[PDB]
């Protein structure tokens, strides 16, 4: 697979740091409605606890160049990716745009804007660029399946980093470096077909019945 990702393909971040035992796989996720800041979901130990992929998935929208992005953002009112391109990532569930914030935490100066979903795409702080991160690849080359890379915010010069601070391995846009890997999910498929991760109704008969659970506020637990 050449990993075309022709501007319509679900993607998930799959980077981690060797901290506890073996760099336990953590995926960036967010819920949107509620706390805007993103968090990390463990996924390597899926056998004991299943991962929460409903709110973890991200989708790709645009892969314009840096100068193309500058022109587009100056004048506002299917294609494979190329290394060193501005990227546009949207949250699949909440339909918000992944971006950075204008505030920091942890009580230390350590200038690092928090990473959180944005209500609207505009704001100049939403796009990211996949810059060279390893000698195996070079600027101006393609991107492969599971190719590790570094993501740099267009506005915030700080990189997207898995800040393994005193907390539970938070993600912050500090001036560190970590090889953020991207793994693919469903893409352009056959119309009206089954797909892993699709919320579906299991219907029996024409209009007889369907799989259900006891209604809310039931006398017994809804098990």
């Amino acid at each position: 697979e050449v990993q075309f990702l022709r501007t319509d393909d679900e993607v998930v971040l799959q980077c981690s740091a060797t901290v506890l035992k073996e760099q336990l796989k953590l995926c960036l996720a967010a819920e949107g409605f509620g706390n805007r800041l993103c968090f990390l979901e463990p996924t390597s130990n899926a056998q004991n606890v299943p991962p929460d992929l409903a709110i973890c998935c991200f989708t790709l929208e645009q892969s314009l160049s840096v100068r193309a992005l500058q022109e587009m953002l100056a004048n506002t009112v299917h294609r494979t990716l190329l290394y060193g391109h501005a990227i546009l990532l949207r949250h699949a569930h909440s339909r918000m745009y992944l971006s950075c914030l204008t505030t920091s935490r942890s009580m230390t100066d350590k200038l690092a804007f928090d990473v959180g979903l944005q209500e609207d795409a505009t704001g100049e702080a939403c796009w990211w660029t996949m810059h060279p991160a390893s000698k195996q690849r070079s600027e101006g080359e393609k991107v492969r399946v599971g190719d590790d890379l570094i993501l740099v915010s267009v506005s915030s010069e700080r990189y997207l980093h898995l800040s393994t601070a005193s907390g539970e391995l938070q993600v912050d846009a500090s001036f560190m470096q970590t090889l953020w890997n991207m793994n693919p999910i469903c893409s352009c498929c056959e119309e009206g077909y089954v797909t892993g991760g699709h919320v579906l109704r299991l219907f029996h008969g024409h209009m007889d019945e369907c799989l259900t659970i006891s209604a809310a506020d039931s006398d017994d637990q809804r098990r």
Partner: protein, 48 residues
Amino acid sequence: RLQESISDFYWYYSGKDVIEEQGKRNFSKAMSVAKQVFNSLTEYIQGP
């Protein structure tokens, strides 16, 4: 690389409707080289 270089140079004068004299010479310099590259590629194929 030359194609990517000129395409990036294209996304510099797209907004502006006037091309400066310095920009005109740079465009001529790159295109005059691209033609020479194209001719060399043809000679590798002619005489099939």
